[PDB]
Design a protein around this ligand. Structure first.
Ligand code: COB
Length: 267
């Protein structure tokens, strides 16, 4: 019931705070299953009224919280070069650490929960949960899907513009952050039912279909330049450092962080 659901969300929001770059949004599993299709491979095996929380990161996750974590790890390992050698997966390591701290408190409020990440997969490499769909049904961010922007006798999107095993995918836009955010995790509480809860509708960000199609092209074809993130004209944005980091392949990223821990000062 709903006081308990609110107490659960409160612990999450205490330990994964807005200031450090997290948000949470409540939704019902039934809303997700209705959207993906009740018989789709993505349908989740919980009753319709089961409580879930979507956790997303905002610009300060990287710029503030992760920066603090990298500074500390550098101190712990003794040098930046040592951290780089020993921590191949810094973003996921940071998130795992923060989620464990949260979970230690959350277990005392509701002991039974499952956690699915944006990167979680089955052994067949199917994503376990579709985050943009969660974001839309939870009202967190409007999900712009290519299949919703077709025109009769128009071939859009182009075919064969992207590399192997890549599809032309949709894009969610947040009402504060545009594309300067990411989905991170969903917590599912199988023993907590919230049938009376009504999710808010996601705010429309792009109202003209030609802007949507342009945004989707910028995302699929040009994402390294982060232009897609500025649709909706957000004022709260990823830093330059953060856009450089996520625009690079993982093997080239650590050097972007060197100044955080090796510079006496900045100028
Ligand atoms: C399965 C199908 C395709 N979608 C997917 O397969 C996406 C899954 C996944 C894991 C995302 C996380 C996740 N767990 O969701 C993530 N990627 Co990928 C890391 N990605 C990849 C994968 C392939 C990308 C590709 N182009 O094919 C890569 C690893 C290469 C990948 C790479 C990137 N990715 C990137 C990003 C940012 C994201 N990626 C996402 C999409 C996500 C959500 C991850 C995140 N964390 O937030 C990012 C986008 C956020 C946003 N603002 O929307 C990016 C830029 C990361 C980077 N900096 O390097 C980079 C390039 C993006 C690009 N456009 O190519 C993948 C696979 C994903 O979903 P679908 O929505 O089309 O179908 C679905 C269907 C299922 O039955 O029902 C639903 N439905 C039906 N009707 C209705 C609805 C739903 C609603 C709401 C309705 C109202 C009606 C809905 O239509």
């Amino acid at each position: 019931e709903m006081s308990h659901a609110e107490s659960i969300k409160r612990v999450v929001d205490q330990k994964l705070s807005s200031h450090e770059g997290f948000e949470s949004h409540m939704f019902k599993i039934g809303s997700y299953n209705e959207a993906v299709g009740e018989s789709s491979p993505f349908a989740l095996p919980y009753d319709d009224s089961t409580m879930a929380l979507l956790i997303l990161s905002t610009p300060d996750m990287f710029d503030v919280a992760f920066r603090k974590w990298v500074v500390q790890k550098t101190m712990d390992f003794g040098s930046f070069d040592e951290v780089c050698e020993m921590v191949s997966s810094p973003i996921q390591s940071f998130l795992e650490d923060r989620l464990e701290i949260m979970s230690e408190k959350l277990r005392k409020v509701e002991e039974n929960f499952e956690i699915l990440h944006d990167y979680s997969m089955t052994p067949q490499r199917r994503p376990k949960i579709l985050m943009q769909t969660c974001g839309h049904v939870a009202g967190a961010a409007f999900y712009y899907q290519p299949c919703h922007f077709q025109e009769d006798g128009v071939t859009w999107p182009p075919a064969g513009r992207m590399g192997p095993n890549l599809k032309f995918i949709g894009l969610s836009l947040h009402p504060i952050y545009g594309g300067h955010f990411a989905f991170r995790s969903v917590l599912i509480f199988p023993n907590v039912k919230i049938p009376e809860f009504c999710e808010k509708e996601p705010r429309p960000i792009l109202t003209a279909s030609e802007d949507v199609r342009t945004a989707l092209e910028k995302f699929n074809y040009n994402w390294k330049d982060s232009g897609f993130r500025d649709f909706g004209n957000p004022t709260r944005r990823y830093s330059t450092t953060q856009m450089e980091f996520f625009g690079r392949p993982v093997a080239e990223r650590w050097e972007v962080l060197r100044p955080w821990v090796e510079n006496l000062y900045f100028q």
